[PDB]
């Protein structure tokens, strides 16, 4: 019974002490100098941290076929001009919506078969002249391979379209602009679930949803044209994915094309340019391959950073330290 | 807002992401089925006490 009382004393003292510590932390970190110092200390820890040695949904057939199709696009899209790329993307999106609309045609174009000649003949007879030669070649390559499910087919086509647009963005040299715009649109779509839900409903006609997107946040004066086109094309062909998740996938793919990895860094406040460069360098060193850092701002962190790449998270948030202290009591 | 709507009728109720009631009383929660659905006229608004 004595030790029972002692334990009650321990829990009470710990709870009050940790509450006082939390108040002290909150008071001390309100100063922006405190925020910057916390971020700098966490970055130091990050340099001290050891490096990490280490389209998933696609199965074997779909994944291999998509690899073949992306290789084919890389081959064909070598010297195509920017206007040609805008075209090619347009025809690819049109064909994707065609396949989606014509369920029977997609079905017949889906089943794997040892001989690809009948499928190629079918495509040529269908749209030999309705689209340019490069589109014909890409679609022929896409149908030649096998797909685990018919859906993957259209996915592959859609992928190519996105790639094409990204390519012209690269030709424009504004890859950074389009990536930033795509991430911002993903943020606002996630923040406004109603807009995503109204856009993420294929049942309604696609033209109306595209017009809604254009008028709401995509026809704005200060929006990169390539990003707007990519987002409108994505929503137009949308199959049932959440619009915000679709935009996040677009941004992730855009960064992937540059060979980098997206790192979602959550901070209490915005970071300095020097801090941003240091963070990018340390994250690249830890993960090896270069990483592009996207800043979320959340006051509840109280300081530090909460980085996350892939399925891995480095939680330096001060609030996390406070929670650990709360749960670490005897 | 943050009010769900009946989807299937045991009644399945679909809530906005980030507003799913905890495993709660609703007015027109047994399981979280994912995609912000929970299991407890289709489309009637549903509110959570919290």
């Amino acid at each position: 019974m004595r030790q029972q009382l002692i334990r009650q004393l321990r829990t009470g003292l710990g709870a009050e002490a940790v509450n006082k510590a939390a108040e002290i932390v909150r008071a001390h970190v309100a100063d922006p100098q405190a925020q910057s110092a916390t971020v700098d200390r966490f970055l130091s820890e990050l340099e001290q941290m050891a490096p990490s040695s280490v389209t998933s949904r696609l199965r074997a057939a779909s994944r291999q076929s998509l690899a073949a199709l992306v290789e084919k696009f890389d081959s064909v899209a070598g010297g195509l001009d920017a206007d040609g790329l805008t075209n090619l993307a347009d025809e690819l999106a049109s064909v994707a919506k065609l396949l989606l609309s014509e369920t029977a045609l997609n079905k017949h174009l889906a089943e794997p078969t040892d001989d690809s000649a009948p499928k190629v003949r079918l495509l040529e007879r269908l749209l030999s002249d309705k689209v340019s030669a490069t589109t014909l070649d890409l679609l022929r390559t896409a149908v030649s391979n096998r797909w685990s499910t018919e859906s993957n087919l259209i996915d592959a086509v859609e992928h190519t379209a996105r790639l094409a647009l990204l390519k012209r963005a690269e030709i424009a040299g504004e890859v950074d602009e389009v990536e930033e715009q795509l991430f911002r649109f993903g943020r606002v779509l996630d923040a406004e679930p109603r807009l995503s839900a109204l856009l993420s409903d294929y049942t309604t006609p696609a033209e109306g949803r595209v017009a809604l997107l254009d008028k709401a946040l995509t026809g704005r004066p200060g929006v990169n044209q390539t990003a707007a086109a990519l987002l409108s094309q994505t929503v137009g062909l949308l199959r049932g994915e959440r619009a915000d998740e679709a935009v996040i996938d677009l941004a992730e793919l855009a960064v992937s094309r540059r060979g980098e990895v997206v790192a979602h860094v959550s901070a209490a406040a915005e970071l300095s340019d020097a801090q941003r460069t240091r963070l990018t360098e340390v994250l690249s060193r830890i993960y090896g391959r270069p990483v592009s850092v996207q800043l979320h701002v959340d006051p509840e962190l109280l300081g530090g950073l909460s980085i996350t790449v892939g399925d891995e998270v480095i939680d330096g948030s001060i609030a996390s330290r406070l929670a650990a202290a709360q749960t670490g009591l005897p | 807002k943050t009010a769900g709507r009946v989807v299937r009728i045991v009644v399945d109720v679909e809530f906005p992401r980030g507003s799913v009631p905890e495993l709660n009383a609703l007015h027109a929660v047994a399981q979280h089925l994912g995609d912000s659905l929970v299991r407890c006229v289709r489309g009637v608004e549903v509110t959570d006490t919290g």
Partner: protein
Amino acid sequence: DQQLSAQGDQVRSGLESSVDGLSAKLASRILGVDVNS
């Protein structure tokens, strides 16, 4: 237990004085740089 309860009520008041030091040290630890407060 009444003697024990009285001891508990006395010691909790006695130790309330030192909570400032413990909380300050804990904040010092979970900030990396010591906080004087």
